[PDB]
Design a protein around this ligand. Sequence first.
Ligand SMILES: N[C@@H](Cc1c[nH]c2ccccc12)C(=O)O
Length: 398
Amino acid sequence: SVWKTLNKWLPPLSRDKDWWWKTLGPQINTLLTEADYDLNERYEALLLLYRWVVPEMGPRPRSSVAPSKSFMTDDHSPIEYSWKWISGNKKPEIRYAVELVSPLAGSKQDPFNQIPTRNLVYNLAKIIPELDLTWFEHFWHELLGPGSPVLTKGSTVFAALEMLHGHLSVKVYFIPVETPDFSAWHQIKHAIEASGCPNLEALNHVDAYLSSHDDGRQLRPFMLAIDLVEPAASRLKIYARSNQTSFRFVRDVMTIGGLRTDLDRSIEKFSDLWKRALGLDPDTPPEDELPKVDHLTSGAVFNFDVAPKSQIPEVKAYIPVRHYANNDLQAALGLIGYLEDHGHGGYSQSYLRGLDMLAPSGQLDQATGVQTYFAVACQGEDLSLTSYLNPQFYAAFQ
Ligand SMILES: N[C@@H](Cc1c[nH]c2ccccc12)C(=O)O
């Protein structure tokens, strides 16, 4: 094991850091091994983890009570893994989002725990010269800076590392603090308009859908995600959540009220996957809402990519497995069955072994929580799928 080797020879850590090292290290190493990453990339990922992530994770879990109300996951685990299924039975892409913490979190010097993420981004920029920080600083000052603004989701920023087989990408997520006169969408839209975009036609499409369309008026934007590459090549993901959960609503959102055409085949496959992943009756009417779940992150959630060189925005929908499925094994078998039916499930067993590694001992088939979302994007006539995973440090405290 790469982690066993590194842990054997790297200098020992303090109690808290060692706990994070011996927990996150094996988890990341297992996910990367099952996805067939070469050895050097596993060493690199664990060396980065040991040097720049583990020291900034704060005190180790000691109970089921979390030290913060982090918006990363429902149980406030500050780590979320993701497993992107690549078509053609190619190797999956492993990514992980992290919200680092410091003792200053909550104080006047850092009331919303932003400094650790900024430090991580600059540290990564030192080692990765291809990283561009122009949009990082622009959106940082616009959304979280001294000029920005009561109501908070539990976090305001976090970062993600994407191991794209041979190179590393970094993403940054901003969760604006809302005030009675400055909602999250107002701040995000103003920041994008002030970012120097060549064409803002897709942003206007998203704005018109959100403001005027009956279904689009039911969505509440809350988060913005950018890529730390050249701004012409970076995506602009605008996340929005709604209380409605019927697939008729989900479908209308995927098409942005009919703006996007030629998606009938993809949406049919989406409908099948939605029902299988959630364990719904095959004849469930698309106009029926899902049974009510009352939670901060319940309902249907999406993101709109308003990227340049594309006048029509793209939509990714997230199937909230943790809130509406029966149990993790059932949702996993539905996803894997869909993949098998379309000849895209070469890494299904590897994925199941990863779930077994991540799951709290004896809970896959009786509870939810491990798989947070199944992300679905429509690519022509096929689906692009991603599994998001919560290690559940506190809800499953061992
Ligand atoms: N945990 C928050 C933010 C978040 C993390 N990963 C996500 C993936 C998709 C949508 C939102 C999220 C939520 O569920 O909303």
